[PDB]
Amino acid sequence: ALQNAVVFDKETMDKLLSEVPKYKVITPSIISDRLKISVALAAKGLQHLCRQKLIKLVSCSSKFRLYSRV
């Protein structure tokens, strides 16, 4: 079906706000490993977790961005 997706969906935003902020290393890349969404919309997605402080930042960067648990 969809190896990577564009979608705004239930299970997207569900799995985001539970599984993701637990992880020790968080990149936009590794969410694309879950065969769910791109590494595109991942990035932007993470930025509105980081706004609401479910996750924290480690480096200001361009293309290279990462995050950790809060």
Binding site: Q47, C50, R51, L57, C60
Partner: protein, 140 residues
């Protein structure tokens, strides 16, 4: 005068003048949305909108090194002519926009052709980069 080379002078010092140039509109933002001064593309004309960061530079620079006008300015334009016909690559630059920009900056910016700069609008918007932005949130 102090325009460009004051306090910072990266993106930060250009964003604030663009913001200014909007609001109270005092400057032409002429028709022609279609125009490519830095070339090479097979995609949409400008992603971030060309007119938006273009304006500041053509008073800033012009009052830094003083009487840099029309064809001087294309030198800090860019390009490779990246896709060519299994040829090598060049520089290039298309000059026209600088003239119609410097006319649309002649309300506020350039004092005259002969000498340049008023009391320096960006000596002011420059000085609040130590202090304030237009907002502060998570990743600024």
């Amino acid at each position: 005068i102090r325009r460009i080379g004051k306090k910072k002078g990266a993106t930060m010092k250009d964003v604030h003048p663009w913001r200014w140039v909007k609001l109270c509109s005092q400057h032409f933002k002429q028709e022609g949305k279609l125009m490519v001064p830095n070339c090479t593309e097979i995609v949409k004309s400008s992603h971030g909108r060309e007119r938006a960061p273009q304006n500041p530079d053509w008073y800033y620079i012009r009052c830094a090194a003083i009487l840099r006008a029309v064809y001087m300015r294309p030198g800090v334009g860019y390009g490779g002519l990246s896709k060519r016909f299994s040829n090598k690559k060049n520089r290039g630059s298309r000059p026209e926009i600088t003239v119609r920009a410097s006319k649309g900056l002649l309300h506020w910016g350039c004092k005259s052709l002969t000498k340049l700069g008023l009391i320096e609008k960006c000596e002011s918007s420059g000085h609040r980069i130590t202090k304030n932005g237009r907002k502060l949130a998570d990743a600024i």
